[PDB]
């Protein structure tokens, strides 16, 4: 399984060559190479059969990371004010990380999570970054809140899911208020337009069965035009008027926006609209993705854009986009008519050796050595570690089996579109859409025999789902609840 | 010491509203007295939808303590427009925010909304401000995105002159001279030269661009930014790879720039993306086995971090 995933310790580490042309980029790169390679030098090779003497042991310090997340989970110092508008993310980073680490919350604590998040829900639609009496709704807290309710909630009267179901029409109306004619969404009233909002909106709309044609119009075109000449995706595309005569990407290909763009596009491929979604260049996206994996001297972590530094959070943003790009490339190959596509071993080595907090301290995972761990990097390092450990693919036979078991006669009330002709043409078309969207959302599998657990089985974490980034054992009962499947 | 707002004469008529967290919230933040007080009164201000100078002052107090507070930024902009405040004065305040370290998706979007609403007939002074702001961090993503938006928005209004575009390319060229590894400035060059609707596409311009790209590769042969730009350039304009191969082959060991006869020092060969170029040029010539051979060498020897990807490209050749 490792013929094409060489360990970082098995390869010659060498600096990025200067070509005798110094620059500020190269000064930072070289300094970062020194930092990471020195930590690898102090650390026993995780693949070694007996851990070496004097060296640091790289085993995943799951209990330290649990304690890191617990201490910040029930009280945060005053400095976290800068994240006061991000508290649903603090919830999500915590409870998804605990899911990945295999640590259960008790029911009382889960109930506190649900109650906290429901106080962020506005009756007019959507979650904000804080209580509804203090913050307006925002697409990004709405994703983080919905996913956190998938992780911590349940179908009972105190489980939060019932409240989400009752909120479907208002959430939909919030989404439609966010919609721009060119296919972008503002993240909130008066807010910025980029693929983060598209991603967060499409995930929530998929999970809650509130997708309509009017919601999706031009959304595919906005995302497709975000792809740059490098093959990744920028934050947004600009529509030049003549509807628009052309669309132009507005910045660099970036791992964060490439994740959101690939995931958004992938979610759109489930939607049965004519000539929809507008295609992307999947091969160029796959090429960009694999090119962002760092060299052995930088630990095999991912960078977020060309000529910048590796960072553990891109294990999720870039690494977690790889199965999506791979599947889109597979689909185009099949339309014209298996070795791992990135170094799954090296990414785990980066996570274990470089991205963990030094042992016996606060715990947590981090951007890189020399950076303080935080909830965000803890969640995204572990999410990317999961993608590296477990070979995830989107299985057509699984989707086909899902189609066979779908019950189109069960479901929540159809959303009422804002425009008279903005819904599905008829129940045949709406039910076919519900079936395709639900069946593909549940199409990701872990490939049997594809597991690679660097450092031994005690390093294994649970399997996250590409596109959604929650465990499948959370995704399945959650989306089944809102589509009334069982 | 701090004076509570319940003790302020200007605020004596306002009953603050407490944060509605519910009984025992998770991830609670231990807010400073100043921040809690300001938010208690903002909740009251926002609930009654008061548009006033004191509400404006309160929003500034809050976004200084938390520049990421998108709700308060939204309220602040609605105050500016409701009160017909000087948006030029607000821009001057936003210059200081980024100066006093206060930055965010919200500060940058606020600046964009200001520029959109002012709608200057000539945005040159904002262009120059943005150029200056890139000195501390020349790769600041929001800033590069904002610069793209500024040129795109005001060019749709017909307000970017040919002189302005030309000075912008001059500025971009200087950025890449100071750091040819600045991928953000490479992306900007692509906008200026290729993607923007007003870009010239002629035989001259394609020749000039290819000269600039090749010169850049020969200056820094291992610069991924220059290689990706070359590959995007050729792909975008449907240009064959083979005619340029003479300038690339020395890195895989006429009339366009060639490598320096003694290659610069610290240039270990082969350059993997040069091999990628060679392999794709073999595919262009339908020499699929010669391409597979280069992919195999990238996989097994010259770019082993991507051993699996390069093996995938090798298998595709069959």
């Amino acid at each position: 399984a490792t013929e094409f995933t060489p360990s970082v310790y098995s390869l010659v580490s060498k600096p990025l060559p200067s070509n005798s042309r110094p620059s500020a980029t190269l000064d930072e790169q070289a300094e970062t190479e020194d930092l990471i390679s020195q930590l690898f030098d102090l650390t026993a090779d995780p693949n070694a059969l007996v851990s070496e003497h004097g060296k640091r042991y790289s085993g995943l310090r799951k209990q330290e990371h649990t304690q890191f997340l617990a201490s910040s989970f029930f009280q945060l110092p005053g400095k976290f004010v800068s994240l006061d508008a991000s508290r649903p993310w603090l919830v999500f980073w915590t409870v998804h990380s605990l899911d990945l680490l295999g640590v259960a919350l008790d029911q009382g604590t889960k109930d506190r999570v649900v109650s906290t998040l429901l106080h962020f829900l506005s009756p007019k639609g959507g979650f904000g970054g804080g209580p509804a009496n203090s913050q307006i709704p925002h697409l990004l807290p709405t994703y983080a809140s919905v996913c956190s309710l998938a992780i911590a909630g349940n179908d009972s009267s105190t489980g939060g899911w019932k409240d989400l179901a009752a909120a479907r029409q208002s959430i939909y109306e919030f989404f439609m208020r966010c919609k721009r004619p060119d296919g972008g969404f503002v993240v909130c009233e008066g807010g910025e337009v980029d693929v983060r909002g598209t991603y967060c909106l499409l995930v929530v709309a998929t999970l809650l069965d509130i997708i309509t044609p009017e919601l999706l119009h031009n959304v595919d075109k906005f995302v497709s035009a975000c792809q740059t000449y490098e093959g990744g995706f920028a934050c947004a595309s600009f529509p030049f008027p003549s509807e628009p005569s052309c669309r132009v990407s507005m910045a660099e290909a970036h791992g964060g926006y490439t994740s959101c763009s690939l995931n958004s596009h992938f979610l759109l491929t489930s939607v049965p609209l004519p000539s929809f979604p507008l295609s992307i260049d999947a091969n160029a996206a796959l090429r960009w993705t694999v090119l962002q994996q760092g060299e052995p001297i930088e630990g095999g972590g991912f960078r977020g854009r060309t000529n910048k530094l590796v960072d553990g959070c891109y294990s999720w943003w870039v690494g977690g986009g790889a199965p999506v790009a791979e599947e889109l490339v597979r689909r185009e190959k099949s339309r014209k008519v298996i070795p791992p596509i990135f170094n799954r071993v090296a990414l785990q080595e980066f996570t274990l050796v470089a991205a963990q907090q030094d042992p016996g301290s606060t715990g947590g995972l981090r951007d890189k050595p020399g950076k303080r761990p935080d909830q965000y990097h803890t969640c995204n390092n572990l999410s990317g570690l999961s993608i590296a450990q477990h070979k995830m693919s989107h299985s057509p036979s699984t989707v086909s089996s899902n189609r066979l078991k779908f019950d189109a006669s069960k479901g929540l009330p159809a959303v009422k579109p804002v425009a008279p002709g903005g819904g599905w043409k008829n129940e045949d078309e709406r039910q076919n859409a519900r079936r395709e969207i639900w069946a593909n959302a549940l199409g990701w599998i872990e490939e049997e025999g594809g597991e690679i657990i660097v450092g031994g089985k005690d390093n294994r974490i649970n399997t996250t789902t590409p596109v959604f980034n929650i465990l499948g054992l959370r995704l399945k009962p959650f989306i089944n609840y809102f589509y009334c499947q069982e | 010491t701090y004076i509570p707002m319940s003790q302020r004469r200007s605020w004596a008529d306002v009953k603050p509203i407490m944060q509605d967290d519910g009984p025992n919230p998770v991830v609670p933040i231990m807010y400073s007295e100043e921040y809690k007080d300001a938010m208690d009164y903002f909740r009251a201000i926002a609930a009654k939808e008061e548009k006033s100078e004191r509400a404006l002052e309160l929003t500034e107090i809050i976004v200084r303590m938390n520049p990421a507070h998108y709700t308060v930024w939204q309220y602040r902009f609605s105050l500016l427009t409701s009160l017909n405040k000087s948006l030029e004065d607000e821009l001057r305040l936003m210059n200081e925010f980024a100066v006093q370290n206060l930055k965010s998706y919200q500060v940058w979007h606020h600046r964009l909304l200001l520029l959109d609403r002012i709608s200057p007939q000539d945005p040159v002074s904002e262009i120059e401000y943005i150029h200056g702001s890139l000195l501390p961090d020349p790769k600041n993503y929001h800033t590069w995105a904002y610069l793209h938006w500024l040129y795109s928005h005001f060019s749709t209004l017909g307000r970017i002159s040919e002189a302005q575009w030309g000075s912008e390319l001059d500025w971009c060229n200087e950025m890449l001279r100071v750091d040819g590894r600045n991928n953000s400035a490479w992306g900007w060059r692509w906008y200026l030269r290729v993607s923007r609707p007003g870009a010239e596409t002629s035989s001259r311009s394609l020749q000039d661009e290819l000269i600039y790209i090749l010169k850049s590769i020969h200056l820094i042969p291992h610069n991924v930014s220059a290689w990706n730009y070359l590959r995007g350039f050729l792909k975008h304009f449907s240009l064959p790879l083979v005619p340029i191969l003479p300038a690339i082959l020395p890195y895989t060991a006429f009339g366009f720039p060639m490598p320096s006869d003694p290659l610069p020092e610290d240039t270990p060969l082969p350059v993997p993306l040069a091999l990628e170029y060679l392999a794709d040029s073999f595919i262009e010539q339908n020499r699929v086995d010669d391409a597979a051979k280069v992919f195999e060498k990238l996989s097994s020897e010259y770019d082993q971090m991507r051993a699996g990807y390069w093996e995938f490209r090798r298998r595709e050749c069959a």
Partner: peptide, 4 residues
């Protein structure tokens, strides 16, 4: 942790 600035993603929004």
């Amino acid at each position: 942790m600035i993603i929004m």
